[PDB]
Amino acid sequence: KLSPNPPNLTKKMKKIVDAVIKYKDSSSGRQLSEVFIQLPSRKELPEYYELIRKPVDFKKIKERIRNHKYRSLNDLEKDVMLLCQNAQTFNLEGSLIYEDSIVLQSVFTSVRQKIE
Numbered sequence: 001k002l003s004p005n006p007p008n009l010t011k012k013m014k015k016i017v018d019a020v021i022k023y024k025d026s027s028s029g030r031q032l033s034e035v036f037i038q039l040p041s042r043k044e045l046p047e048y049y050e051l052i053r054k055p056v057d058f059k060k061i062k063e064r065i066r067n068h069k070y071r072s073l074n075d076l077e078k079d080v081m082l083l084c085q086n087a088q089t090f091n092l093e094g095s096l097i098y099e100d101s102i103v104l105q106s107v108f109t110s111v112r113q114k115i116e
């Protein structure tokens with residue numbers, strides 16, 4: 001049970017993550033975040049957990065905002081960048097999931113800059 005963040009910070013983290021999650025592909029209209037909202041279980045995808053040291057998904061990113069685990073936008077950014085790097089490790093270059101993760105990193109940076 002961590003000490004609560006200032007409300008403005010919690011509110012800002014949620015605003016940024018909400019915008020990344022809602023973002024739609026600029027050609028197909030697909031919500032890029034969809035595959036990354038909730039990890040498959042270990043039973044469903046054991047190869048993922050065999051490879052990736054610290055699985056994260058947008059559900060966990062929201063939990064870490066909620067529980068005040070992130071103490072700044074930099075802590076939040078580190079986990080969103082980890083989510084995308086994990087995608088780049090488990091999926092091939094030139095796969096849609098890989099290339100979607102590169103786009104989502106750019107969306108996070110852009111939205112954070114705007115909300116700041």
Ligand SMILES: Nc1nnc2c([nH]c3ccccc32)c1-c1ccccc1
Binds near residue numbers: 040058
């Ligand atoms: N190749 C993937 N690669 N990365 C992830 C993922 N699901 C996630 C759910 C949450 C976080 C990362 C991932 C998948 C996947 C996509 C379709 C079906 C099963 C898993």
